[PDB]
Each structure stands twice: as C-alpha cells, then as structure tokens.
Design an enzyme around this catalytic site. Structure first.
Site, PDB file in Angstrom:
ATOM      1  CG  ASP A 171      -2.194   0.871   1.008  1.00 30.58           C
ATOM      2  OD1 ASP A 171      -2.494   1.292  -0.134  1.00 30.58           O
ATOM      3  OD2 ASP A 171      -2.880   1.137   2.027  1.00 30.58           O
ATOM      4  NE  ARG A 182      -4.008   5.407  -0.276  1.00 30.14           N
ATOM      5  CZ  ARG A 182      -3.839   5.169  -1.575  1.00 30.14           C
ATOM      6  NH1 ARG A 182      -3.782   6.160  -2.458  1.00 30.14           N
ATOM      7  NH2 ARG A 182      -3.728   3.922  -1.990  1.00 30.14           N
TER       8      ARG A 182
HETATM    9  O1  LIG Z   1      -3.572  17.321   8.293  1.00 26.67           O
HETATM   10  C1  LIG Z   1      -3.003  17.691   9.350  1.00 26.67           C
HETATM   11  O2  LIG Z   1      -3.086  18.886   9.718  1.00 26.67           O
HETATM   12  C2  LIG Z   1      -2.238  16.779  10.076  1.00 26.67           C
HETATM   13  C3  LIG Z   1      -2.542  15.420  10.031  1.00 26.67           C
HETATM   14  C4  LIG Z   1      -1.766  14.508  10.753  1.00 26.67           C
HETATM   15  C5  LIG Z   1      -0.672  14.929  11.513  1.00 26.67           C
HETATM   16  N1  LIG Z   1       0.144  14.123  12.243  1.00 26.67           N
HETATM   17  C6  LIG Z   1       0.056  12.780  12.366  1.00 26.67           C
HETATM   18  N2  LIG Z   1       1.144  12.188  12.887  1.00 26.67           N
HETATM   19  C7  LIG Z   1       1.219  10.802  13.092  1.00 26.67           C
HETATM   20  C8  LIG Z   1       0.111  10.043  12.732  1.00 26.67           C
HETATM   21  C9  LIG Z   1      -1.010  10.679  12.211  1.00 26.67           C
HETATM   22  N3  LIG Z   1      -1.028  12.026  12.050  1.00 26.67           N
HETATM   23  C10 LIG Z   1      -2.181  10.020  11.815  1.00 26.67           C
HETATM   24  C11 LIG Z   1      -3.331  10.795  11.955  1.00 26.67           C
HETATM   25  C12 LIG Z   1      -4.570  10.257  11.602  1.00 26.67           C
HETATM   26  C13 LIG Z   1      -4.659   8.959  11.104  1.00 26.67           C
HETATM   27 CL1  LIG Z   1      -6.233   8.310  10.667  1.00 26.67          CL
HETATM   28  C14 LIG Z   1      -3.505   8.187  10.944  1.00 26.67           C
HETATM   29  C15 LIG Z   1      -2.266   8.715  11.315  1.00 26.67           C
HETATM   30  C16 LIG Z   1      -1.195   7.844  11.090  1.00 26.67           C
HETATM   31  C17 LIG Z   1      -1.216   7.003   9.959  1.00 26.67           C
HETATM   32  C18 LIG Z   1      -1.110   5.613  10.047  1.00 26.67           C
HETATM   33  F1  LIG Z   1      -1.015   4.959  11.269  1.00 26.67           F
HETATM   34  C19 LIG Z   1      -1.119   4.843   8.891  1.00 26.67           C
HETATM   35  C20 LIG Z   1      -1.205   5.424   7.634  1.00 26.67           C
HETATM   36  C21 LIG Z   1      -1.298   6.799   7.531  1.00 26.67           C
HETATM   37  C22 LIG Z   1      -1.293   7.581   8.686  1.00 26.67           C
HETATM   38  F2  LIG Z   1      -1.396   8.960   8.534  1.00 26.67           F
HETATM   39  N4  LIG Z   1      -0.053   7.860  11.797  1.00 26.67           N
HETATM   40  C23 LIG Z   1       0.298   8.687  12.990  1.00 26.67           C
HETATM   41  C24 LIG Z   1      -0.387  16.297  11.535  1.00 26.67           C
HETATM   42  C25 LIG Z   1      -1.158  17.220  10.832  1.00 26.67           C
END
Ligand SMILES: O=C(O)c1ccc(Nc2ncc3c(n2)-c2ccc(Cl)cc2C(c2c(F)cccc2F)=NC3)cc1
Length: 261
Positions: free
Chosen positions: A129, A133
């Site tokens: 995958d 994204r």
């Molecule tokens: O848009 C913004 O402003 C924004 C969005 C996100 C972050 N930071 C952040 N950091 C770590 C993670 C995530 N988001 C995150 C958030 C939500 C979800 Cl549904 C998944 C995750 C994930 C993830 C994962 F496990 C598998 C695959 C993809 C992933 F994106 N991993 C941790 C900062 C700003």
C-alpha cells in the site's frame, strides 16, 4: 516493546478515524505524539494485528520509518503511541503547497522514502500500500513510511499484483515509482481520468504516466524503470537510493529537465 503508563499520556484532539478506532494527537512525558487506540470489544484478529503492528514498529530503527514511542497494552483501550508528524500525510501536504519546493527538496523527500522502503525490504516486509497518502512529513521535511500496508489501491499496484496477487518488494518498487510521480506533480491523481478497469488495461498495454512539469530527465527515467512490466527489470530499492544520492550530491544534474507536454 516499551510499555507506557497511561498517566504519562494525554489525548488532546481527535485527528483521524483509523484502522482500529480513533487516532489522536497528544502529549507524552512533554513530546507531542499521535495515539492510535483499539476500542473495546475488539476481536482476537484485531488484537493480533494491532499489537503485531506495534511489535514490528518498535523493533524497527530507521530515520525514514515512523518512530514508535511505546504501547499501552495493560490498560484499555489499548494504545499505539508514535512520534507526531507535524506536516501530516504527504499527498495532502503537497496538494496544499503546489510549487513551493525546489527540485532538490523534492528529490530529497523521495530519497528518504526510498531509504525507508529499502529498510523494510531488507527486513523482509512487503508494504503493498505504498502511496503518498501513507507517507508522513515532519517539520524537517523528512518523509517516513507508515501504515504498513496491507497484510488494493489499483492505481499504485504493480501489474503482477493486480493480475495474480504476487506482491513482492519489486511490486513495492512499482508503487514507489507512482509515489515519485505524485511528489513531482505535487499530488496529482495517477491516471486522473481513467477508470480502475481502464488503468489495468492501459498498464498491460504498456501505457504509463506522463512527464510531470519541471521534472529532471534522470527522475522521469528512474520512475519509468520502476514501471518495467517485467519484475526482474525493475531496480532494487538499493539501486534507487544510490541513484538518488548521486543526483543529490551533483545537484546540477537535476537542472536537465525532461520535456513536458
Ligand atoms: O492534516 C493535518 O493537519 C495533520 C494530520 C496529521 C498529523 N500528524 C500525524 N502524525 C502521526 C500520525 C497521524 N497524524 C495520523 C493521523 C490520523 C490517522 Cl487516521 C492516521 C495517522 C497515522 C497514519 C497511520 F497509522 C497509517 C497510515 C497513515 C497515517 F497517517 N499515523 C500517525 C499532523 C497534521
């Protein structure tokens, strides 16, 4: 895996729906973190996947793989605590920053993804995958692989994996070529355009994604090699990292652009 006591964890805001239940940003003993939870009534399979995922991430130690801070397994709901990635998902990041980076910065991002992917392939994991994204970006512009993929995104998937479910590190190399194209176009949708069935038909007829604007010849040539119909003719991730390293060390090589149309 480091077991984290819940008193050291503070959820602050829901940021996602996630494979296992909600995902939060929060604070940890303070360092900001992302917190993935496994809500109550989870199944045996769900528990094995949730803690299995955490088990592999904690063991991994690579700059371009998401860092795991630890898990909460003794208490419920169970939690996976990772480093917080300030700029979020790469696809969304690029689409909100159209044209703001130099070609050298774009190629540096791809190098990091290639290195991270290489670490995974050498450790004997197939992602399946690999897409923009599923890459996250921090405030140093470092891209780190997350998600871990599946244990089927048509537009990112290699022909042999679509056609007879052969997923290997070489089909990840195909997906990486798509990621290269996503980065170089600032988050355009592959094959924009075509239906899923038409993409599969087009790929097998030898059709490929076109040259992005402002794309170095070497970069378009490399992604075209990632898209060789025959698995064995694709470069390895080791080859990819090496080539991108040479381009980054001689940055004038990136000034020769493939023709755009
Ligand atoms: O848009 C913004 O402003 C924004 C969005 C996100 C972050 N930071 C952040 N950091 C770590 C993670 C995530 N988001 C995150 C958030 C939500 C979800 Cl549904 C998944 C995750 C994930 C993830 C994962 F496990 C598998 C695959 C993809 C992933 F994106 N991993 C941790 C900062 C700003």
């Amino acid at each position: 895996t480091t077991e984290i006591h819940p008193s050291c964890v503070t959820r602050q805001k829901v940021i996602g729906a996630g494979e296992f239940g909600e995902v939060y940003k929060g604070m940890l003993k303070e360092v900001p973190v992302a917190i993935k939870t496994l809500k109550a009534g989870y199944t045996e399979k769900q528990r094995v996947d949730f803690l299995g995922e955490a088990g592999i991430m904690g063991q991994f130690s690579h700059h371009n793989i998401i860092r795991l801070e630890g898990v909460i397994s003794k208490y419920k709901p169970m939690m996976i605590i990772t480093e917080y990635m300030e700029n979020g998902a790469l696809d969304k990041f690029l689409r909100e920053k159209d044209g703001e980076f130099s070609v050298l910065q774009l190629v540096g991002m791809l190098r990091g993804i290639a290195a991270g992917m290489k670490y995974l392939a050498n450790m004997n994991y197939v992602h399946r995958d690999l897409a923009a994204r599923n890459i996250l970006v921090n405030s140093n512009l470092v891209c780190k692989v997350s998600d871990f993929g599946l244990s089927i995104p048509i537009r990112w998937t290699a022909p042999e994996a679509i056609s007879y479910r052969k997923f290997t590190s070489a089909s990840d190399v195909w997906s990486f070529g798509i990621v290269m194209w996503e980065v170089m176009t600032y988050g355009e949708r592959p094959y924009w355009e075509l239906s899923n069935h038409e993409v599969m038909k087009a790929i097998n007829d030898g059709f490929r994604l076109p040259t992005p604007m402002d794309c170095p010849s070497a970069i378009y040539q490399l992604m075209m090699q990632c898209w060789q119909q025959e698995r064995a003719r694709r470069p390895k991730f080791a080859d990819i990292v090496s080539i991108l390293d040479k381009l980054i060390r001689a940055p004038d090589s990136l000034k020769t652009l493939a023709d755009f149309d």
